[PDB]
Amino acid sequence: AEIYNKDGNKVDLYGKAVGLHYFSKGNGENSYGGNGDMTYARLGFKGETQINSDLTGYGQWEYNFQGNNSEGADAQTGNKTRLAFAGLKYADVGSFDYGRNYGVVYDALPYSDDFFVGRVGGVATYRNSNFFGLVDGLNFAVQYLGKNERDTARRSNGDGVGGSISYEYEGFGIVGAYGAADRTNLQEAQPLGNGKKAEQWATGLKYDANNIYLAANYGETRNATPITNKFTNTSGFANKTQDVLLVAQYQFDFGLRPSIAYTKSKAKDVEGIGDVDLVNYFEVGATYYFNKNMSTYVDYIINQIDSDNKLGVGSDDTVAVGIVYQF
């Protein structure tokens, strides 16, 4: 909500309280999403100041407060800052910002701290829209990722670059995104995956108009995707994955947006196992929007993964019912 706006600066204090429960058989150890209370909330701010007609400053922070912990020792589990960055936008030259932000590969997609696919720290991002204002519909972004040596291999990263180009024409959109980066000493000391460099690229198509939203991506990865062998308690990254994502949605005027999606991600050459599906499921769900501030929804994960998945990846279904308020 725009809580402030005077003298050219406007702040937006936003957030939401989400009542959310997951239903999966057993102890949700072997299911898709786990089982139980998954209630949580979000708080964040988006500032933007008009330095002058062409120049704009801006920043944004976003936190995630879990709502299913005891007020005990485990009180903090799951909490974290998702975003934190300040930047400038100048006329038609483009924009630049640095901080914790989204990797450029995510730029095309209808994991966190996973190189260029989700949110990561230390990224300087440049973005240009309409090709310096010369080509309506042509945008691009390049990104520099500062090395991040964490106490954990899954959480670390070496220096890298990435970029993405996308062209949008009348509800239509096409996107290409690629990234490469070094792997830390620790990432390399890991038991699964082999290489001193990690890459992630994905392309995408989308039709976004007329209450309709279809989208289809295809991409791959090298030593970027995190995988764990539940049997051996072994971890590392997949040598190679091939990922497919499909999404079809339709928004009814009353507030019903039914969704159908399919996702498959399969590892290749996994040291010891060979080929293994990491993710495989359909997803049926419906969201109902009372208005812009309130909504409820039931997602249904029809897990396709079988019980003899070498990695030990779960094969059970999960049903997610949630009620959402937001400002």
Add this chain to the structure above:
Amino acid sequence: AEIYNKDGNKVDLYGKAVGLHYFSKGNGENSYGGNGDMTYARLGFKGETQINSDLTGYGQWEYNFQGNNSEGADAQTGNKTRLAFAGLKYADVGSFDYGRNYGVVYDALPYSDDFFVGRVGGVATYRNSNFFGLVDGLNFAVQYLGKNERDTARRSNGDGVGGSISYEYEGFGIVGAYGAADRTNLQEAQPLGNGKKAEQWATGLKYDANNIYLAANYGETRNATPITNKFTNTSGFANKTQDVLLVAQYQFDFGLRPSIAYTKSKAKDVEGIGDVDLVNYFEVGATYYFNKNMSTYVDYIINQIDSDNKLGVGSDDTVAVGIVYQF
């Protein structure tokens, strides 16, 4: 404070900074409230959106930031989300919400993560006011508590239900609240307390009008109340407790609200000890309200617990002086 209100949605960003110190002899190990700086702050939001004339959406989050930690490793100690839930209210049919919220037994009372007495995660709560609008003054609430297997027995819980009925007539109010729930494998592996089910019920009376506020509850519990044997460093729950709470207050027009309260809680059949007082004290205090945003107060705990309390419960007094700002 109502920071937002446009297009039928209004947000209330609230909170407070509390300068608070506790005075108790020794190292406050053996006193009632501990000794020292107990300064802390609170931040939270309450949203509410009018989906239409009869339908209302709403959500609320509340955090607790301790103000007495170093900016060091212990920086986070005590912090936690107290509340997090979204719900809907429809005409006279009642309301429903899910998330971290208050147990229904608390519904009658002028511990957290303790079944139905304080705040707990994963509760779906239904509440009806004025009996579908047919009986002014008659309300009720039923509550479903999702199992919560935590790493800690004191923090865990099995499935359960609870409900409460209350009737309020002209400053008068009567309340009945009951709850029962399963106990987790871990809760049962505990050394104190025996049963595979936990119950908590309490009833209450109150006179709330004319600058006066009297109130008196009485209740009991089975394997619900957490107790620790400071000697044996043993923990578990009390087999049976009988709890009494008394409160008398009077608000002077200038801003002085003097208070007198008495609280006694006594365990029964404690494996090994027999009967033992868990809590026993009078409480004299006075709050002074400068206005709705500022206030100060001195509470005085006249601990009745004696020095030969088998559990090792503290017997010292405590004086609490605090200054409060709030928006």
Add this chain to the structure above:
Amino acid sequence: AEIYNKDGNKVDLYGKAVGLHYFSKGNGENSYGGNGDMTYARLGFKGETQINSDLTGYGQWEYNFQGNNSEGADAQTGNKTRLAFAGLKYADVGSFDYGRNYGVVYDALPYSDDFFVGRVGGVATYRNSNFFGLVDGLNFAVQYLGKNERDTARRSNGDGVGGSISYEYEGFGIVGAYGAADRTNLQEAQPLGNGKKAEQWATGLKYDANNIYLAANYGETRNATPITNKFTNTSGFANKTQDVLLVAQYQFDFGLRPSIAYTKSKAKDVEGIGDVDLVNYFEVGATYYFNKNMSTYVDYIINQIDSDNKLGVGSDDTVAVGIVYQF
């Protein structure tokens, strides 16, 4: 930003998103500021309510959310409440507040949880301006510090008092600040430093007017300053330090504020080493203010510490580039 102001109470919700990176050679283990992403954000509130013409209530909370952690286990590292206190201000009698706040020695200075130099918990602070309104330009503050026995010597403290007097006349300002406090059992069990009392005093001069800002402090300490012997992995406090701080700045009308500063802090009688520089560096930097909400800057630390610093204090340079948004 003043988000609220009705019925005599006004809240200011403030904060900022800071993109910030540090450039230092090697693994920044031996440099001045460390190396890498140092992005972070801040959120805080300052309330103030007019109880009546002369009486004012107020409170303030301030948190620090790191923006360079993974959303993993290390998610919380660095986060903490910096401030948390409520107080009252009465006519010309002065003001009093209690909570986590700034030590009075900091009162003169153009470490946290370090007695009276930075922020500390449990301080009751009294402040008088213009000598009960009788002497324009004469202010003073006395401060009581509640004992703070933490699990860590560096983070603990015994009872103490401190005070400061300062006189400001037309861009000119002079300041004296002194403090003394007991040292905890643990602080005394430490291998470096000897005494059962800690003192910190510093004096200061400043010229603040005409786009100019010069300032110069001088002070000392006894068993107050924390020091670590990187070789022996020994820690404790310095027996004696002599600290000098110098700052010259000039604000150009366009938004350029170039700065020059020098800081030297040298320990004395360090058990085993003798005299050792703790801090020694010049600092060249320039801040550029687009407006009151946006800014960018490059600081350059010209570390003077040599490579043969007995404590093992770093000798490398560091360059800090940061972009700031704030409301």
